[PDB]
Amino acid sequence: LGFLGAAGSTMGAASITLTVQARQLLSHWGIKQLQARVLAVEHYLRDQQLLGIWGCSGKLICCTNVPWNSSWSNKSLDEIWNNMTWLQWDKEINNYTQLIYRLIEESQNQQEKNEKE
Amino acid sequence: LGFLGAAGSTMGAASITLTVQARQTHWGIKQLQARVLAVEHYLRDQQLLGIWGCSGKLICCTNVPWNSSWSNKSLDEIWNNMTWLQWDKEINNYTQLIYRLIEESQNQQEKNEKELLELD
Amino acid sequence: VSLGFLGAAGSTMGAASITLTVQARQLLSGTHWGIKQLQARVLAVEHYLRDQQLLGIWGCSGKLICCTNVPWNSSWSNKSLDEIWNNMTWLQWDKEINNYTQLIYRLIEESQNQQEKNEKELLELD
Amino acid sequence: ENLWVTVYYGVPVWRDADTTLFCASDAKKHNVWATHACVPTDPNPQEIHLDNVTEKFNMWKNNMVEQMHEDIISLWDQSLKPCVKLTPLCVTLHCTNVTREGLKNCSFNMTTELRDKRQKVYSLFYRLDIVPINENQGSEYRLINCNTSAITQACPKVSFEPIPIHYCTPAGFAILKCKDEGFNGTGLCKNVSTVQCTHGIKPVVSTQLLLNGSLAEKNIIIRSENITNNAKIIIVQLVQPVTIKCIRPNNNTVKSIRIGPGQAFYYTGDIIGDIRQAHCNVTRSRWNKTLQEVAEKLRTYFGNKTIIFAQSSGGDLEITTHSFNCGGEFFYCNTSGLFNSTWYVNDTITLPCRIKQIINMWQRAGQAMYAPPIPGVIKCESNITGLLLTRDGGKDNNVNETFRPGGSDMRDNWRSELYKYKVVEIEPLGVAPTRCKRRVVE
Amino acid sequence: REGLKNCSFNMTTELRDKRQKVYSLFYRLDIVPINENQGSEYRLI
Amino acid sequence: GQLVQSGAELKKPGASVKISCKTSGYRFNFYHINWIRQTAGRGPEWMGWISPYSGDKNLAPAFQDRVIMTTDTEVPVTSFTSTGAAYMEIRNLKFDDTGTYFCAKGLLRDGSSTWLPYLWGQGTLLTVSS
Numbered sequence A: 001l002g003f004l005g006a007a008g009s010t011m012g013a014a015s016i017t018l019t020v021q022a023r024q025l026l027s028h029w030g031i032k033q034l035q036a037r038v039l040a041v042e043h044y045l046r047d048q049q050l051l052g053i054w055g056c057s058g059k060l061i062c063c064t065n066v067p068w069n070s071s072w073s074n075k076s077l078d079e080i081w082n083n084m085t086w087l088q089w090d091k092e093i094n095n096y097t098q099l100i101y102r103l104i105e106e107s108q109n110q111q112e113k114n115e116k117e
Numbered sequence B: 001l002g003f004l005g006a007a008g009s010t011m012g013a014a015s016i017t018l019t020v021q022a023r024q025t026h027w028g029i030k031q032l033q034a035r036v037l038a039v040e041h042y043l044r045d046q047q048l049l050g051i052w053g054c055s056g057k058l059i060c061c062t063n064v065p066w067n068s069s070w071s072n073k074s075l076d077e078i079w080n081n082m083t084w085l086q087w088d089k090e091i092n093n094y095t096q097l098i099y100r101l102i103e104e105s106q107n108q109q110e111k112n113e114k115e116l117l118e119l120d
Numbered sequence C: 001v002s003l004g005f006l007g008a009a010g011s012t013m014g015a016a017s018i019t020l021t022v023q024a025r026q027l028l029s030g031t032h033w034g035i036k037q038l039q040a041r042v043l044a045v046e047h048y049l050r051d052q053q054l055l056g057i058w059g060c061s062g063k064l065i066c067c068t069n070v071p072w073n074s075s076w077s078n079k080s081l082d083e084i085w086n087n088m089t090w091l092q093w094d095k096e097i098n099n100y101t102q103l104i105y106r107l108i109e110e111s112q113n114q115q116e117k118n119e120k121e122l123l124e125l126d
Numbered sequence D: 001e002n003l004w005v006t007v008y009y010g011v012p013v014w015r016d017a018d019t020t021l022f023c024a025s026d027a028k029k030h031n032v033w034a035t036h037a038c039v040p041t042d043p044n045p046q047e048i049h050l051d052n053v054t055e056k057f058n059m060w061k062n063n064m065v066e067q068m069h070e071d072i073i074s075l076w077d078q079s080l081k082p083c084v085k086l087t088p089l090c091v092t093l094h095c096t097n098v099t100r101e102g103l104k105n106c107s108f109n110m111t112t113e114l115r116d117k118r119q120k121v122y123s124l125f126y127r128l129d130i131v132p133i134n135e136n137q138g139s140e141y142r143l144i145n146c147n148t149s150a151i152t153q154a155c156p157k158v159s160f161e162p163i164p165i166h167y168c169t170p171a172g173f174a175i176l177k178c179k180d181e182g183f184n185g186t187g188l189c190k191n192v193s194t195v196q197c198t199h200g201i202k203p204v205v206s207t208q209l210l211l212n213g214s215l216a217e218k219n220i221i222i223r224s225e226n227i228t229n230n231a232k233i234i235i236v237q238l239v240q241p242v243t244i245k246c247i248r249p250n251n252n253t254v255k256s257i258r259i260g261p262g263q264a265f266y267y268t269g270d271i272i273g274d275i276r277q278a279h280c281n282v283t284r285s286r287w288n289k290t291l292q293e294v295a296e297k298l299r300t301y302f303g304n305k306t307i308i309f310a311q312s313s314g315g316d317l318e319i320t321t322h323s324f325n326c327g328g329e330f331f332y333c334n335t336s337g338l339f340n341s342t343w344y345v346n347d348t349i350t351l352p353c354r355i356k357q358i359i360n361m362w363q364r365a366g367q368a369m370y371a372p373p374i375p376g377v378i379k380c381e382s383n384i385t386g387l388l389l390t391r392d393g394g395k396d397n398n399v400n401e402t403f404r405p406g407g408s409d410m411r412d413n414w415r416s417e418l419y420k421y422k423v424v425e426i427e428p429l430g431v432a433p434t435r436c437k438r439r440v441v442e
Numbered sequence E: 001r002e003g004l005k006n007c008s009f010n011m012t013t014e015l016r017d018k019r020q021k022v023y024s025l026f027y028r029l030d031i032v033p034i035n036e037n038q039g040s041e042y043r044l045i
Numbered sequence F: 001g002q003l004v005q006s007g008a009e010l011k012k013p014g015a016s017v018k019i020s021c022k023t024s025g026y027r028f029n030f031y032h033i034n035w036i037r038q039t040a041g042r043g044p045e046w047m048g049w050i051s052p053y054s055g056d057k058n059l060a061p062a063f064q065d066r067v068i069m070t071t072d073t074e075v076p077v078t079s080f081t082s083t084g085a086a087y088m089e090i091r092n093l094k095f096d097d098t099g100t101y102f103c104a105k106g107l108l109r110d111g112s113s114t115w116l117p118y119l120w121g122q123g124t125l126l127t128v129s130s
């Protein structure tokens, strides 16, 4: 356990510790200290804004309506969840991450239109 | 359209664009103040939504009845004949009152939901 | 009819639950001087977000009152509900469990993560 | 029909607001405006046209102007803090004529690296920078700043060249821009659009003519808080630029002396070749065309009175002459050759100029700067973009009106670029009645 | 009463090479005698 | 919490008596102070109660014309405890009034049963004789 103690663990095993890293994202020279404090806040809020945009706010794990594109990865769920770390996983899809994020946002926009009816 | 592109449109027409608008040494000091200011305004609005129970939604229905003294206009008169800018002026003296009523209703709702769960 | 900010502080915990929104609101709202004002503004934001960080992790975000799946431990308190809700202020209560506050928080976080893991699995089976 | 309160977020509502703005600049000597500190600009800036929106603008109440003025002064002051203090420079000077009397050859005891030693220095000074000491011998002089302020040398490594500055607004706030083809900076604007930042604005400083600014799209635009009140400044924006070319023909030889540990003073040791007065050239045909067009538009406010242009009535050099920064040298030019004209409806102009090394751009008591001389021949060209005019009131004679250049308020230069912008706060929350009622448990 | 003394000194001027003679009244509390104790010469505290 | 009472004394018929009730270890103003009588020929009987917070009292119909209740202003010891006293005066004493008198502390600050006499003092004897 401990902060990032799961970093070398399998992606499935690591999911048991998500709350461990979710916490402690928050907490002349007076200016220097404030810039760092603001930066910690901005990064925290940046991630929270994305979750709000995706409709995932308030959840550690959030399912979406976006289908997986096999070109992002052809690996099976068993290979991904039990034979990889999250660090390795991010590298494999590092060039598709921004695309995936945009697709989630588009899917939420369609959902909002349907909820209005 | 775009950011605030709906501002001249009617209140009803504007409702489709809420998703779009939901988004968004000397110089270094001013940038620090700018960054703090942007954060305070983002959180100010989220603070109210979280209290109201409306968080995560662009449109949130409540249990507070409309008071005709706030406006005597029919829904067609409001939603299709006005901009949000015009509407904001009409209820400018009642907006804080409405906010308090929403908050009171939320606390009563959650208290009642707690009691229902206690009985199960 | 409001008691005002902290007007409920002397009230019983059950009565105090009526006024939670009074306290929840204004957490953000309430040159030598210029720097002090900037520090005050940043601090208020950190304070507000600290509590929200915990609520988002607990799944309690967006709610004034949030029920959980964590059982009460009699070692934290042996009091009956009437002894707590009708006979105490929140100020007294916080002191009674002050040593267990962090312990409880970790248990809530663990329960939330397992709950969401299970909710995903239930959906995967459908 | 039971109506219920419904909460909306992302609502297109705004109100006028005063905000802190920050600079942005395109990626790229050291610049005095410290634009390297600025946020990189978006490679493709966004603008949103607002249909069915009419908004009130008032360039004279626009607080972006006052904020920009403070930014310009603050940057200027910071740039001088590391630079040489020249406190030792203020000492009795003994002066003679050089080898127009615009220059004098002065001798003085300057300080040296060691406190025990002094060094005689000969240098050229402009007569404008010097005040005689009333011994009535005519040989003893002092620098003009000595009875008012300490003077600081500008660093030779810092350029005064203007760089466009984009003013950007914090999230939750936005800038509205007026797009009307002709707009006098006040009243309602029919075509309104929203931008995150302004177009880049050059921090050009001038006293009578506006240089290197934006042009009017179709017609000359005349702006004033109140035309009838002659006290108010009139800002005129031209459709087409008039090129002004300026030169300092003298070949200055620049020499330097250490005046203490870590410090040095720069001065002109001599001039090579004949000494000649600085001057600027404005094309006569373009200028006469320009004045006529300005007169035709001014005439529409005055009941078809004859339009007379005239030179400034008097006062301080900073007011009575056109000033600008060219090559890092500070010019003062006599514009009476430009503004001497009358219009009855029915080659080049050469303006003499003088250069000062001692300046006070913001007209602040207790402050002064010494510009170092720039070696060799100095040449530049600029576009006259607009005019600053005032009017002579107090007369009931309806035959004519008289206009004169310039004014004391430096902030009016910023207004010429900022008149089209307004800062507003965005308020995403609002409430309105609907038939919808919130669902509850059981 | 010795609440005040009339002091004289050569003060600096706008120009480094020039000096001016200044006469001024000072409160005795701000004035300290030179340790030579001549009684005619003083310095600021 | 603890309650103590004025010691026993002998009275003549028709005499008035005043009984103190000093308290400690709890906030005096947070709870009702009850007075309860017991006699051999009657058993336990209520004399009603007083709230030090509002000064409000509820006297039983039997005693409304003969019993007066008052309280002292509380003096704090800790932020959550204080000291103070309640007093009861009985006028026109009869031989029928002989017996043990008790002072008692209210049960809860809220809920349906706030005034119940959770803590009792030792009680003292009142005697009437001619």
Ligand SMILES: *[C@@H]1O[C@H](CO)[C@@H](O[C@@H]2O[C@H](CO)[C@@H](O[C@@H]3O[C@H](CO[C@H]4O[C@H](CO)[C@@H](O)[C@H](O[C@H]5O[C@H](CO)[C@@H](O)[C@H](O)[C@@H]5O)[C@@H]4O)[C@@H](O)[C@H](O[C@H]4O[C@H](CO)[C@@H](O)[C@H](O)[C@@H]4O)[C@@H]3O)[C@H](O)[C@H]2NC(C)=O)[C@H](O)[C@H]1NC(C)=O
Pocket: C007, C008, C010, C011, C012, C015, F029, F030, F031, F032, F051, F052, F053, F054, F056, F057, F058, F059, F109, F110, F111, F112, F113, F114
């Ligand atoms: C500060 O601290 C004080 C002291 O702790 C707090 O006061 C307590 O507040 C709670 C609020 O709920 C009180 O609970 C209630 O108690 C009453 C008791 O009845 C008495 O008080 C009445 C006050 O109006 C009074 O009317 C009664 O007497 C009159 O009427 C009777 C009947 O006709 C008559 O016989 C008398 O002669 C009088 O004419 C009587 O003195 C009780 O009635 C209440 O019951 C309702 O509410 C509960 C809870 O919801 C509910 O369960 C019941 O079914 C019912 O609906 C209720 O129990 C408590 O008694 C107060 N304590 C004291 C010592 O006074 C105060 O609130 C604190 N302040 C702050 C700011 O927090």
Ligand SMILES: *[C@@H]1O[C@H](CO)[C@@H](O[C@@H]2O[C@H](CO)[C@@H](O[C@@H]3O[C@H](CO)[C@@H](O)[C@H](O[C@H]4O[C@H](CO)[C@@H](O)[C@H](O)[C@@H]4O[C@H]4O[C@H](CO)[C@@H](O)[C@H](O)[C@@H]4O)[C@@H]3O)[C@H](O)[C@H]2NC(C)=O)[C@H](O)[C@H]1NC(C)=O
Pocket: D029, D159, D160, D161, D162, D204, D211, D212, D324, D325, D326, D327, D375, D379, D380, D381, D382, D383
């Ligand atoms: C209105 O707009 C016009 C057009 O933009 C402005 O005119 C242009 O202004 C620029 C900047 O002054 C000018 O470019 C310079 O040309 C000079 C020609 O002699 C150069 O000497 C100069 O470079 C030197 O100065 C720079 C100052 O920042 C240094 O960064 C640079 O390194 C040079 O200095 C070094 O080299 C010289 C070599 O001689 C040496 O003496 C120095 O000590 C140092 O070592 C620039 O390249 C354009 O030529 C101008 N354009 C025209 C058509 O004239 C005009 O100024 C604007 N008006 C106002 C009021 O702002």
Ligand SMILES: *[C@@H]1O[C@H](CO)[C@@H](O[C@@H]2O[C@H](CO)[C@@H](O[C@@H]3O[C@H](CO[C@H]4O[C@H](CO)[C@@H](O)[C@H](O)[C@@H]4O)[C@@H](O)[C@H](O[C@H]4O[C@H](CO)[C@@H](O)[C@H](O)[C@@H]4O)[C@@H]3O)[C@H](O)[C@H]2NC(C)=O)[C@H](O)[C@H]1NC(C)=O
Pocket: D094, D107, D108, D109, D120, D121, E017
């Ligand atoms: C750098 O600095 C040095 C030092 O200041 C300058 O050298 C001095 O130059 C001045 C002339 O400019 C010399 O002045 C002359 O001094 C004579 C002697 O002074 C008597 O009085 C002084 C006290 O005041 C005594 O100390 C001294 O012993 C003498 O008893 C005067 O007689 C001269 O007077 C005549 O000229 C003045 C000019 O203004 C007239 O007003 C008088 O009426 C009269 O005609 C004169 O004052 C001085 O002596 C020099 N000092 C030294 C140490 O040599 C340098 O010139 C200067 N360098 C530069 C480039 O400025």
Ligand SMILES: *[C@@H]1O[C@H](CO)[C@@H](O[C@@H]2O[C@H](CO)[C@@H](O[C@@H]3O[C@H](CO)[C@@H](O)[C@H](O)[C@@H]3O)[C@H](O)[C@H]2NC(C)=O)[C@H](O)[C@H]1NC(C)=O
Pocket: A005, A006, A008, A009, A010, A013
């Ligand atoms: C650090 O890396 C090692 C090697 O990858 C991890 O070892 C593996 O740990 C898991 C448990 O976390 C073991 O899983 C179990 O395997 C048995 C069969 O051996 C099975 O019956 C269980 O149901 C379960 O799947 C796994 O075998 C083990 N691998 C090896 C090769 O021993 C270790 O867990 C890593 N540590 C962390 C904290 O992630």
Ligand SMILES: *[C@@H]1O[C@H](CO)[C@@H](O[C@@H]2O[C@H](CO)[C@@H](O[C@@H]3O[C@H](CO)[C@@H](O)[C@H](O)[C@@H]3O)[C@H](O)[C@H]2NC(C)=O)[C@H](O)[C@H]1NC(C)=O
Pocket: D245, D246, D247, D280, D281, D348, D350
């Ligand atoms: C501003 O306008 C004046 C007047 O038109 C310009 O003056 C002209 O400058 C040129 C170039 O220096 C002069 O021509 C040269 O004169 C010398 C004289 O010895 C000769 O040897 C060269 O062969 C050449 O002919 C010209 O005579 C002069 N005109 C006048 C009336 O003096 C000036 O150059 C303009 N300034 C700028 C920056 O354009």
Ligand SMILES: *[C@@H]1O[C@H](CO)[C@@H](O[C@@H]2O[C@H](CO)[C@@H](O)[C@H](O)[C@H]2NC(C)=O)[C@H](O)[C@H]1NC(C)=O
Pocket: D131, D147, D148
């Ligand atoms: C600094 O010196 C100059 C030159 O002697 C002074 O200039 C004159 O000042 C008077 C007022 O005291 C004005 O009426 C004159 O018009 C000034 N003359 C010119 C040519 O500008 C100046 O006042 C002195 N500054 C101070 C603060 O005493």
Ligand SMILES: *[C@@H]1O[C@H](CO)[C@@H](O[C@@H]2O[C@H](CO)[C@@H](O)[C@H](O)[C@H]2NC(C)=O)[C@H](O)[C@H]1NC(C)=O
Pocket: D212, D213, D241, D243, D382, D383
């Ligand atoms: C000063 O004015 C001249 C025109 O008189 C400007 O140069 C012309 O600008 C237009 C528009 O960009 C171009 O189409 C022309 O080709 C330019 N002419 C030449 C000869 O290059 C010039 O840019 C203006 N200067 C400033 C600083 O705005």
Ligand SMILES: *[C@@H]1O[C@H](CO)[C@@H](O[C@@H]2O[C@H](CO)[C@@H](O)[C@H](O)[C@H]2NC(C)=O)[C@H](O)[C@H]1NC(C)=O
Pocket: D184, D185, D186, D187, D188, D222, D223, D224, D225, D226, D227
């Ligand atoms: C700029 O344009 C505005 C709008 O046309 C002018 O303001 C109006 O001027 C007329 C002049 O007769 C007045 O009757 C109106 O009442 C003005 N309107 C308002 C809202 O004040 C303004 O005068 C023009 N400015 C200049 C310098 O010409």
Ligand SMILES: *[C@@H]1O[C@H](CO)[C@@H](O[C@@H]2O[C@H](CO)[C@@H](O)[C@H](O)[C@H]2NC(C)=O)[C@H](O)[C@H]1NC(C)=O
Pocket: D226, D227, D228, D229, D230
């Ligand atoms: C524009 O300026 C004129 C001139 O100052 C103002 O009119 C004058 O107002 C004063 C009273 O304040 C009168 O005594 C003058 O007789 C007026 N002059 C004329 C020519 O009528 C005018 O009010 C200003 N307009 C605005 C909108 O402020």
Ligand SMILES: *[C@@H]1O[C@H](CO)[C@@H](O[C@@H]2O[C@H](CO)[C@@H](O)[C@H](O)[C@H]2NC(C)=O)[C@H](O)[C@H]1NC(C)=O
Pocket: D251, D272, D376, D377
């Ligand atoms: C200004 O004067 C200097 C000195 O005469 C000129 O530069 C010198 O020119 C001679 C002859 O070409 C060269 O041998 C020297 O090496 C030059 N000196 C330097 C430092 O470069 C200079 O060209 C003149 N400027 C103008 C515009 O004529």
Ligand SMILES: *[C@@H]1O[C@H](CO)[C@@H](O[C@@H]2O[C@H](CO)[C@@H](O)[C@H](O)[C@H]2NC(C)=O)[C@H](O)[C@H]1NC(C)=O
Pocket: D311, D317, D320, D321, D334, D335, D336
């Ligand atoms: C600007 O130039 C004009 C024209 O040279 C100057 O006006 C002259 O000033 C001198 C001053 O001694 C007078 O002798 C002339 O009679 C004036 N000419 C006219 C036609 O009046 C004017 O003073 C200059 N401005 C400045 C600030 O120097």
Ligand SMILES: *[C@@H]1O[C@H](CO)[C@@H](O[C@@H]2O[C@H](CO)[C@@H](O)[C@H](O)[C@H]2NC(C)=O)[C@H](O)[C@H]1NC(C)=O
Pocket: D395, D397, D399, D400
């Ligand atoms: C322009 O208007 C002025 C008045 O504002 C006229 O001035 C008068 O001119 C006559 C000569 O024509 C003189 O005798 C007067 O003394 C002048 N008056 C003032 C108040 O100075 C001037 O003549 C007019 N110009 C034209 C071309 O008609």
Ligand SMILES: *[C@@H]1O[C@H](CO[C@@H]2O[C@@H](C)[C@@H](O)[C@@H](O)[C@@H]2O)[C@@H](O)[C@H](O)[C@H]1NC(C)=O
Pocket: C083, C084, C087, C088, F001, F026, F107, F108, F118
């Ligand atoms: C109500 O509380 C009275 C005072 O005790 C204090 O508060 C209680 C809730 C505990 O926290 C205790 O440790 C404190 O000292 C009690 O005297 C009274 O009996 C309580 N009433 C009931 C019904 O429990």
Ligand SMILES: *[C@@H]1O[C@H](CO)[C@@H](O)[C@H](O)[C@H]1NC(C)=O
Pocket: B065, B066, B067, B068, B069
């Ligand atoms: C509307 O507001 C007024 C405010 O005085 C109130 O009296 C009235 O009861 C309210 N109406 C409803 C239906 O709540």
Ligand SMILES: *[C@@H]1O[C@H](CO)[C@@H](O)[C@H](O)[C@H]1NC(C)=O
Pocket: B089, B090, B091, B092, B093
């Ligand atoms: C609200 O109050 C303002 C004055 O503060 C008044 O001008 C406006 O008309 C009022 N609005 C309504 C709807 O009564």
Ligand SMILES: *[C@@H]1O[C@H](CO)[C@@H](O)[C@H](O)[C@H]1NC(C)=O
Pocket: C071, C073, C074, C075
């Ligand atoms: C209750 O607390 C004790 C420690 O006091 C702990 O050992 C026990 O496991 C706890 N029970 C639960 C269900 O958490």
